[PDB]
Each structure stands twice: as structure tokens, then as C-alpha cells.
Write a protein that binds this ligand. Structure first.
Ligand SMILES: C[C@H](O)COCC(COC[C@H](C)O)(COC[C@H](C)O)COC[C@@H](C)O
Ligand SMILES: Cc1cn([C@H]2C[C@H](O)[C@@H](COP(=O)(O)OP(=O)(O)O)O2)c(=O)[nH]c1=O
Ligand SMILES: Cc1cn([C@H]2C[C@H](O)[C@@H](COP(=O)(O)OP(=O)(O)O)O2)c(=O)[nH]c1=O
Ligand SMILES: Cc1c[nH]c(=O)[nH]c1=O
Lengths: 137, 137
């Protein structure tokens, strides 16, 4: 069971003028968008991430190219490749992630429920396991 | 000159792991994000747009590739090429726009101040110029 994770399907409005996916805060995703960020130009052998959050809710969306997201909780690990812009990966609190195999020119957009707060990140895998084992076991 | 438009510069957090640009509503941009949408897979000879808005505020960002934005208000026209993910084109009310020259792989993100409202759009060019003449002249 990969708790606290979902794949959310967005509208894809396509005709001869291209494709357009809209995402409205609290409607298409469950939370209000306080912040967005996006990661570009990642080299092919980079893994990034190596963190969880305590309170943040987030949605990951690969808008070009492809990227693989490795998700861990105590005793499970699942790899999800994102390669469709109409699909978002919801990740709740206390899921550990790492991202790798970003293609050229892969674009990974994140919608976040809160402003950037370094103190809400768990960057220590040992602390992570320690807080997570309490939640998931 | 071209009223109600700005270029906004965002952080670019660049290192060996790649590049990351964050945008926090009301901080990096002047409004809350209620809605984001994105345009992709647009063919090379397509022109998108041909409208204005009455009340919406929005920011345009090209996250991969390049796209040109033709902006017009009565008596004034400017073409802006967007090709830097760390640069946002803020467009306020009553500017007419058209988007063209989407490159292969181009991703155009829009941050919007309101949920989609087809009644806020001005799609009739003659009603646009009539309303804009009232404001800018
Ligand atoms: C270059 C090396 O191969 C990468 O090693 C990754 C790391 C974490 O994985 C934790 C989870 C099981 O995946 C290995 O640590 C062992 C423990 C946590 O001390 C820590 O690296 C963080 C850096 C890359 O920012
Ligand atoms: C996500 C985010 C990061 N940053 C900073 C924090 C980090 O030092 C750097 C990279 O963030 P980090 O979250 O470590 O990136 P990733 O998940 O891709 O590994 O950017 C901000 O200033 N604002 C933000 O919203
Ligand atoms: C921007 C937006 C458009 N749409 C729909 C309305 C239109 O039928 C279609 C195309 O939108 P439009 O804004 O008309 O496209 P552009 O300015 O890129 O030419 O998508 C939404 O459903 N939600 C949105 O947020
Ligand atoms: C000049 C002009 C006329 N008609 C349009 O629809 N757009 C334009 O930009």
C-alpha cells in the first residue's frame, strides 16, 4: 500500500490549436495553490529530491518529456514515471521522494499547498524513517 | 507605450542538480494564484489567443522552448519572445493578445488571478477596441 499518494486526471482541451490543461485550486486538486515551482534542465544522471514534508500537500506534473519519481514509505517503494501533462501525482505528508531519469527538456511543475518553509522539510532519511514508522506501522 | 504589461524576474536556483524556479502567490507575483493552466504540443504555424480580459490578471511563462506573444492596445503593439523559464510576462486587463511561433516542445504556463470565466473574455476585436479606447485614450 502506497499511502498518501494519488494520480489525478485533469482535463485536456485539444483540437488543432494544441493542448491546454487548466487546474483550479480546490476544484481540480483538493487544496488551494499557494505556490508553484518548476524544475528544468536536469542532467540525465541526476537524482534530486531526497526529502519528505510534514504538512505540505503537493501535486507533481510532467509537462514535457519524462521523469521518474521514486516514492518511499517504511517498507514500500514504488516508481512512477510521469510523461503526460494531463496527469498529476498527488503526494501527501510523510512520503519520501526522489526524482531521476529526467529527459531532455523535461519540465516538472509542482503545485504546492503552502509557501516554502524549510522547517517543514525532513531531509534526513533517518529522522524520516523515525517519524514515518510511527505513522505507517 | 504598452500599459498594463510587465516582465517579472523570478529566482533561478541553478546548480549541478539542475534549475528550479519558485513562484509564491502575492510574493513573487502581485496576486493570489487561483488557477494555473498550460499549453503544449502546439503546431508551428498556429496562432492562439485573439482576446483580452476585463478583470483577470495573469502571468505567462515559457518553461521550455520559445513562444512569441503579440500584445496590442489601441495604437501600440509589441512582440515579446518568451524563452526563459525565470521570466514572467504579466498582462493586466484590456490588453489584447495573440501567441505564435511555438517551438517544438514548447510549454507555456499561465498563472491566473481568478477561476476560468468565459464572460470575462473579450473575443470580439471590435468590442475590444471600443472598450480599450475608453480606458487608454
Ligand atoms: C551518491 C549516493 O549514491 C546517494 O546516496 C543517497 C542517500 C539517501 O537515500 C535514502 C533512501 C533509502 O533512498 C544515501 O544515504 C544513506 C543514509 C541516508 O545515510 C543519502 O543521500 C542524500 C544526498 C544524495 O543528497
Ligand atoms: C521548492 C523551493 C525550493 N527553494 C530552494 C530550496 C533548495 O535549496 C533549492 C532546491 O530545493 P529542493 O526542494 O531541495 O529541490 P528538489 O526537490 O528538486 O531536490 O531551492 C526555494 O527557495 N523555494 C521553493 O519553493
Ligand atoms: C484558459 C482556460 C481555457 N479553457 C477552455 C476554454 C476554451 O474553450 C479553450 C481554449 O481557451 P482560450 O483561452 O480560448 O485559448 P488561447 O487563449 O490559448 O487561444 O479552453 C478552460 O476550460 N479553462 C481555462 O482555464
Ligand atoms: C489588426 C488585427 C485585426 N484583427 C484581428 O483579429 N487581430 C488583429 O490583430
Amino acid at each position: 500500500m502506497l499511502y498518501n499518494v494519488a494520480l489525478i486526471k485533469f482535463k485536456d482541451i485539444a483540437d488543432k490549436y494544441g493542448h491546454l490543461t487548466p487546474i483550479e485550486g480546490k476544484i481540480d486538486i483538493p487544496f488551494d495553490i499557494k505556490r508553484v515551482y518548476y524544475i528544468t534542465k536536469v542532467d540525465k544522471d541526476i537524482t534530486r529530491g531526497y526529502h519528505s514534508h510534514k504538512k505540505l500537500h503537493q501535486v507533481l506534473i510532467c509537462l514535457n518529456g519524462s521523469v521518474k519519481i521514486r516514492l518511499k514509505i517504511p517498507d514500500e517503494e514504488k516508481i512512477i514515471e510521469l510523461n503526460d501533462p494531463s496527469v498529476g501525482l498527488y503526494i501527501g505528508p510523510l512520503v519520501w521522494r526522489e526524482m531521476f531519469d529526467f529527459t531532455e527538456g523535461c519540465v516538472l511543475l509542482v503545485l504546492a499547498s503552502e509557501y516554502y518553509d524549510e522547517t517543514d522539510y525532513i531531509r534526513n532519511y533517518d529522522f524520516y524513517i523515525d517519524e514515518a514508522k510511527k505513522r505507517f506501522l
